[PDB]
Amino acid sequence: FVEMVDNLRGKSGQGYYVEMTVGSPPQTLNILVDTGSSNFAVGAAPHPFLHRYYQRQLSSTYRDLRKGVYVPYTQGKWEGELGTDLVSIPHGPNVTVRANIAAITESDKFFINGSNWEGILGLAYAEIARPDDSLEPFFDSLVKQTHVPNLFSLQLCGAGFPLNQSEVLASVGGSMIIGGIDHSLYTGSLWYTPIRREWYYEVIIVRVEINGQDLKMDCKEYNYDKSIVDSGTTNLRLPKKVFEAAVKSIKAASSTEKFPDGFWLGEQLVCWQAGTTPWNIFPVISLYLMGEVTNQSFRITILPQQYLRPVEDVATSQDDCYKFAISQSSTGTVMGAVIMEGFYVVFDRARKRIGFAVSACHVHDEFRTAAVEGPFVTLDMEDCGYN
């Protein structure tokens, strides 16, 4: 899968994107890779944050579905016009598919300034596609029309430090392998957690540790009202109760240093003298996920290098600065880009499971590394899921 290695660019804050072509002749667009949604949607009209957009009138293969679509979120929203066109992925499988495309005509806080992507590739299942589950998502179309195996995998590579506009454009962001697993992208073993339901990529968290210390919450809280793998969201998002317990413990473990309280809101940055970030004072976070063998679980361990997102100082000084990349959630546990940066994540749709391995490009120090370890004997795991 050498052709697909290095096909991603971007960063956790603005999202990771792949190059795609739509229409005839091919119109090149950069497309956000998103496991948290199910629509293939592209800018179709001028916008302050877009350098280019989809022009339907210039595509001979465009087909008008004569139907509108409105896609709200909590943080932003877009609306547009449904249609189909020919779509291909230059640095992907060597194929061309007829797929549904939402031509974005109006949007509010959906696009991101300087992100360098002009559309979204919703990789999740039809049930959450808008307007309804009848609008086939891109990947379902891809599998039906070709011989690409029903599987894709993601290696998102955080830099570990801020990248300027030129650097993010020149730098490789990672790899999306379509139809397979590239073994050079990870170390150690792949551990599989089952997909509970095919809508989002829903998983079940059975136990949570901070510096090996059990959070001792009823596991149903960890998955209230769901737990999802979501590459289109920046942060780890945790349900109110879990978030508060986690922040209380992270605060405690890192007490020897004190932070403005707006830091824990993810609003303000904390800075240290160049190279002196006290990584060691921050605790590791372990999430135990349901396993494939009955009564068996495994854990993924995340370092502060994952939950502290590098941002360049307003001072643009010599200092190394970070934002707290864990957010309070009202829509469940959301494993965002900052968590995925630590891992090679296999979306094995054909076997209804998600794999986790230590990423070959994960950021660490000399004393600690991210881990994916197992097995652990765990009981009643099924009732950790919310109904």
Contact 327/236 with Cβ under 8 angstroms? yes
Residue 53 burial class via C-beta count within 10 angstroms: exposed 0-12, middle 13-18, buried 19 and up: middle
Q: Distance (Å, rounded) from C-alpha 243 to C-alpha 214?
A: 14
Question: CB of residue 168 vs ligand 0VB: minimum separation in angstroms?
Answer: 15
Q: Choosing from 34, 140, 320, 348, which is the catalytic residue?
A: 34
Residue 230 burial class via C-beta count within 10 angstroms: exposed 0-12, middle 13-18, buried 19 and up: buried
Nearer of residues 54 and 62 to ligand 0VB, judged by Cβ: 54
Q: Distance (Å, rounded) from C-alpha 337 to C-alpha 335?
A: 7
Q: Choosing from 85, 230, 320, 348, which is the catalytic residue?
A: 230
Nearer of residues 50 and 372 to ligand 0VB, judged by Cβ: 50
Nearer of residues 131 and 149 to ligand 0VB, judged by Cβ: 131
Chain contacts with ligand 0VB (rule: CB under 6 A): 15, 32, 34, 36-37, 73-76, 109-110, 112, 200, 228, 230, 232-233, 237, 331, 334
Q: Is 6 a catalytic residue?
A: no
Q: Is 34 a catalytic residue?
A: yes
- End-to-end CA, the chain: 39
Nearer of residues 118 and 320 to ligand 0VB, judged by Cβ: 118
Nearer of residues 263 and 376 to ligand 0VB, judged by Cβ: 263
Question: CB of residue 172 vs ligand 0VB: minimum separation in angstroms?
Answer: 20
Residue 359 burial class via C-beta count within 10 angstroms: exposed 0-12, middle 13-18, buried 19 and up: buried
CB proximity list for 294: less than 8 A, separation 6 or greater: none
Nearer of residues 62 and 323 to ligand 0VB, judged by Cβ: 323
Question: CB of residue 374 vs ligand 0VB: minimum separation in angstroms?
Answer: 27
Length in residues, the chain: 387
Question: CB of residue 32 vs ligand 0VB: minimum separation in angstroms?
Answer: 6
- Write out the two tokens for 10: 């971007």
Q: CA angle at residue 131 from 125 to 134, to 5 degrees?
A: 55
* Helical H segments across the chain, by residue range: 138-145, 165-170, 240-253, 304-307, 337-340
Question: CB of residue 259 vs ligand 0VB: minimum separation in angstroms?
Answer: 21
Which secondary-structure segment (H or E) carries 320? strand 320-324
Q: Which residues are catalytic?
A: 34, 230
